[PDB]
Amino acid sequence: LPPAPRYFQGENTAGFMRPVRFEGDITNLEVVGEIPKSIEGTFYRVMPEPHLPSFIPNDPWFNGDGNISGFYFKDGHVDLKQRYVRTEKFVREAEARRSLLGKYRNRYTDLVEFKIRSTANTNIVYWRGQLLALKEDSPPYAMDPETLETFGVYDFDGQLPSLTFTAHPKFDPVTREMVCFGYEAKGDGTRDICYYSFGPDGKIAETVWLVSPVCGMIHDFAVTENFVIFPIIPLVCDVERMKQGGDHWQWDYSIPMYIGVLPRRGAQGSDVKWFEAPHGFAGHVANAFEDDKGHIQLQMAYAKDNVFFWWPDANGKGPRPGEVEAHFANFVLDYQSDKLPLAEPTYLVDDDMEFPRIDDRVATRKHKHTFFCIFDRKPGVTDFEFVMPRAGGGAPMSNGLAHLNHETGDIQRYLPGPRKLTGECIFIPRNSEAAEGDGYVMVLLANYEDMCSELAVLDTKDLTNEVALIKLPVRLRPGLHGNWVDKSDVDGHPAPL
């Protein structure tokens, strides 16, 4: 077997990216300022965090074992519980005390045969009294929201029709449905998309098999009252490349950014229309809705080049680190149209942005508030000379949050400071009566001065001001997605506006 390193090496595990790999509890976190005493619930987030040094040099950030953080808030007090998802990979590597899973989404490089290759490291959502730890190459792993115990790989009472479950399911606040899909839904390199939904009682509702024009990465999707929308990142899979030890994903400069539209209910696979947006990178969906004329307004991060630059084209052509900006785009789609090519999108702000969140009380409907990460290169905002030598590599950088009011066009920007960066934020309704986008925003900060993490609590009345700064004495490595589960929501999801 290729030897197992006994300590982490390489930029992807240097400085703030160095794995900590702790599981357990820190109760009564230190607080500067005051956590509003009416906040009650849990902020769950997932980070990739390799449990053992990889035998793959410069293993991408997306290949690290999913470690779940819960921040449990009550009466202005907050406790941290932290635990790794017990994936097949985690358990067998813990047993062997060495890495066994090889390259990102390439089973031909594994040192043993895995049934499930999930790192469960992308998103952590609440569904019918369980957490679901998501990774788009796999079914979910079900976990206990209170103890973070892993129950096991989850197949929805044997109803899961797909080998894959997206990291970005949508929760319809009116129907209480979880709207899902998986791509490569029949295995490596398949063009099968399985679109499926679950009613609030846990019974499968929709199941539609459709076919992607290419085997492309469908990381996120969008749901409106009557449609589901599949934006394809022009990263393309060739299993023959994988069998020779090559990358699962390879950029294709020659294809459009496909945007598939399928009727939400009662459709067959052949009903999908593959619209062709100008070539670019499909970033995260803020939200989509039908306007009065029944046109789909799809609002999402959109870049003009390969954000995942470590997977370039067949000739190694691609951007450098920190070169590609993504912009908050509005695409207009008409399912009735037979024109496949789409206009350039309009842009809602100028900021280099990503990780958009809305008030999920209006998910699939007209939203007028978006909270998102921004990366501002304007001199002074980030002390790059101090931060970059401490930052390591492999993870995106965000040096603020912005709140866009879509009606007034007003933008508020939160800047944690010149030696801090942010993760993805969550939005918390002030209470069950609160107006759209009124309440609290929380975001995890990397503090490069202390080499510690902090959890910032902001009031939407003034995003520029920290109401509380929760001071962790450890690092939480830069992570991916997270969700708020309010104690007042019995099913874990907020009530429709």
Residues near a copy of itself (CB under 8 A) are 6-8, 18-28, 30-32, 51-53, 77, 82, 94, 97, 451, 471, 473-475
With CB under 5 A as the contact rule, the residue among 45, 51, 81, 86 that binds Cl ion is: 86
Task: Tell me: does residue 82 bind Cl ion (CB under 5 A).
Answer: no
d(CA 494, CA 486): 8
Q: How far is the CB of 153 from Cl ion (least distance, A)?
A: 13
Q: Cα–Cα–Cα angle for 212, 268, 221, nearest 5°?
A: 50
Residue type, 8: F
CB closer to a copy of itself out of 23 and 291: 23
The contact pattern for Cl ion, residues 362-401, with x = CB under 5 A and - = no contact, is: ----------------------------------------
Q: How far is the CB of 386 from a copy of itself (least distance, A)?
A: 16
CB closer to a copy of itself out of 66 and 256: 66
369 binds, among Cl ion, a copy of itself, none (CB under 5 to 8 A by kind): none
Looking up tokens 């010149």, which residue turns up? 418
Instruction: Note whether 423 and 444 are within 8 A (CB).
Output: yes
Q: How far is the CB of 22 from a copy of itself (least distance, A)?
A: 5
6 binds, among Cl ion, a copy of itself, none (CB under 5 to 8 A by kind): a copy of itself
Q: How far is the CB of 47 from a copy of itself (least distance, A)?
A: 14
Q: How far is the CB of 141 from Cl ion (least distance, A)?
A: 10
22 binds, among Cl ion, a copy of itself, none (CB under 5 to 8 A by kind): a copy of itself
d(CA 174, CA 223): 13
How crowded is residue 245: how many other Cβ atoms within 10 Å of its Cβ? 11
Q: Which of these segments, 81-89, 130-138, 249-257, 353-361, binds Cl ion (CB under 5 A)?
A: 81-89
CB closer to a copy of itself out of 477 and 481: 477
Q: How far is the CB of 81 from a copy of itself (least distance, A)?
A: 9
Phi, psi of 362 (to 5 degrees): -115, 15
The strand pair at 420-422 and 426-429 is best described as unpaired
Say which DSSP state 94 is in.
H
Instruction: Note whether 421 and 399 are within 8 A (CB).
Output: yes
Say which DSSP state 417 is in.
-
Closest CA to 457 of 442, 438, 472: 442
CB closer to Cl ion out of 86 and 219: 86
CA separation, residue 130 to residues 53, 215, 226 (Å):
30, 32, 28
d(CA 421, CA 443): 10
149 binds, among Cl ion, a copy of itself, none (CB under 5 to 8 A by kind): Cl ion
Please give the residues from 227 up to 286 whose contact with Cl ion meets the rule CB under 5 A: none
Q: How far is the CB of 43 from Cl ion (least distance, A)?
A: 21
276 Cβ contact partners less than 8 Å away, ≥ 6 residues apart: 256, 257, 258, 259, 340, 341, 342
Provide the Cα torsion 214, 219, 225, 226; round to 10°: 10
323 binds, among Cl ion, a copy of itself, none (CB under 5 to 8 A by kind): none
With CB under 5 A as the contact rule, the residue among 123, 150, 197, 382 that binds Cl ion is: 150
d(CA 212, CA 183): 9
CB closer to a copy of itself out of 25 and 291: 25
d(CA 384, CA 448): 11
310 binds, among a copy of itself, Cl ion, none (CB under 5 to 8 A by kind): none
Instruction: Please list the alpha-helical segments (H only) found in 378-417.
Output: 384-391
Q: How far is the CB of 83 from Cl ion (least distance, A)?
A: 7
CA-based end-to-end distance of the chain = 57
Q: Which residues pair with 326 in a beta bridge?
A: 303
86 binds, among Cl ion, a copy of itself, none (CB under 5 to 8 A by kind): Cl ion
Instruction: Please identify the residue of the shown chain whose CB is closest to the bound Cl ion.
Output: 150
Q: How far is the CB of 106 from a copy of itself (least distance, A)?
A: 24
d(CA 343, CA 280): 13
Q: Which of these segments, 79-87, 155-163, 215-223, 314-322, binds Cl ion (CB under 5 A)?
A: 79-87
2 binds, among a copy of itself, Cl ion, none (CB under 5 to 8 A by kind): none
With CB under 5 A as the contact rule, the residue among 25, 30, 146, 149 that binds Cl ion is: 149
Q: How far is the CB of 113 from a copy of itself (least distance, A)?
A: 23
d(CA 119, CA 85): 8
d(CA 117, CA 135): 9
Q: Please report, as ranges, the residues that interact with Cl ion according to CB under 5 A.
A: 86, 149-150
